[PDB]
Amino acid sequence: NDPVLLNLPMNVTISENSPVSSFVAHVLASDADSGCNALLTFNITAGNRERAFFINATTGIVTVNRPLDRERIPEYRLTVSVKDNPENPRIARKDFDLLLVSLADENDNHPLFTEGTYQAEVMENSPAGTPLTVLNGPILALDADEDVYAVVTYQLLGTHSDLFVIDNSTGVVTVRSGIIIDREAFSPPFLELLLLAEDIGQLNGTAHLFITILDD
Ligand SMILES: [Ca+2]
Ligand SMILES: [Ca+2]
Ligand SMILES: [Ca+2]
Ligand SMILES: [Cl-]
Numbered sequence: 001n002d003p004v005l006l007n008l009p010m011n012v013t014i015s016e017n018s019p020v021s022s023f024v025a026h027v028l029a030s031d032a033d034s035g036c037n038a039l040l041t042f043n044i045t046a047g048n049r050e051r052a053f054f055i056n057a058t059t060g061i062v063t064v065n066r067p068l069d070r071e072r073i074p075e076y077r078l079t080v081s082v083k084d085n086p087e088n089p090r091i092a093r094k095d096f097d098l099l100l101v102s103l104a105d106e107n108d109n110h111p112l113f114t115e116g117t118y119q120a121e122v123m124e125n126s127p128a129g130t131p132l133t134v135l136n137g138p139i140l141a142l143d144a145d146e147d148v149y150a151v152v153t154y155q156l157l158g159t160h161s162d163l164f165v166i167d168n169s170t171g172v173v174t175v176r177s178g179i180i181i182d183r184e185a186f187s188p189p190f191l192e193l194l195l196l197a198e199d200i201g202q203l204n205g206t207a208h209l210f211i212t213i214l215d216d
Helices: none
Strands: 010-015 023-026 038-045 052-056 061-064 075-084 092-105 116-122 155-156 164-166 172-175 192-200 204-214
Touching: 010 023, 023 092, 038 052, 052 075, 155 164
Parallel strands: 010 092, 116 204
Antiparallel strands: 023 061, 038 075, 052 061, 075 092, 155 192, 164 172, 192 204
16 A cells, blocks of 8 residues: 555644744654555655745654744645655655644734824814824724734823823824813924834834814
8 A cells, every 4th residue: 555644634833933943743654554664755745835844854853944924924734745765766655644834923013103203183172082183094003913912002102191191992092181272371382292002012113193283
């Protein structure tokens, strides 16, 4: 008959930060079917995108071969082959099956605001809950990580930040209650604030928020 892959098909999760030559899997085989017990050669025949993986041809150990990135290629479908090496290379008896490599998400990305500087305006005397008018799209930071490491919370900083509240989940900025804004109070009538976006690993990004206080 044939040699046999014993532990394939197999699913394994490794860190997207697994360094080059770190262990991924040990592929096991037997040639007890045909009863020959001939010497076995392993190889990866398909799915090996940019040769990100390396299989030791005598031991069947699969190692990381290039830097990995869940954000670039999150999953590999590797076809592993085992063959005997008889005098004629067409007597060659073979078996083929799948080693599926999932990359577990590492927190290697930080929240990036959609703008370096947001341009905003608030009318003086505006009541509590009045949102900023933000003229370059909504306040938004995006974190490229998968799910848990991509949840963003927002804070607002600088002198006269206390006139406003930020929803620490949506990034929406509103006038704080008990505060009414007098344009004549401010020299100049123009605030330079800092927006801060943080993931649960405390990796953050920042953006300027420039606010014109308008007349009425
Ligand atoms: Ca990555
Ligand atoms: Ca990641
Ligand atoms: Ca992150
Ligand atoms: Cl391929």
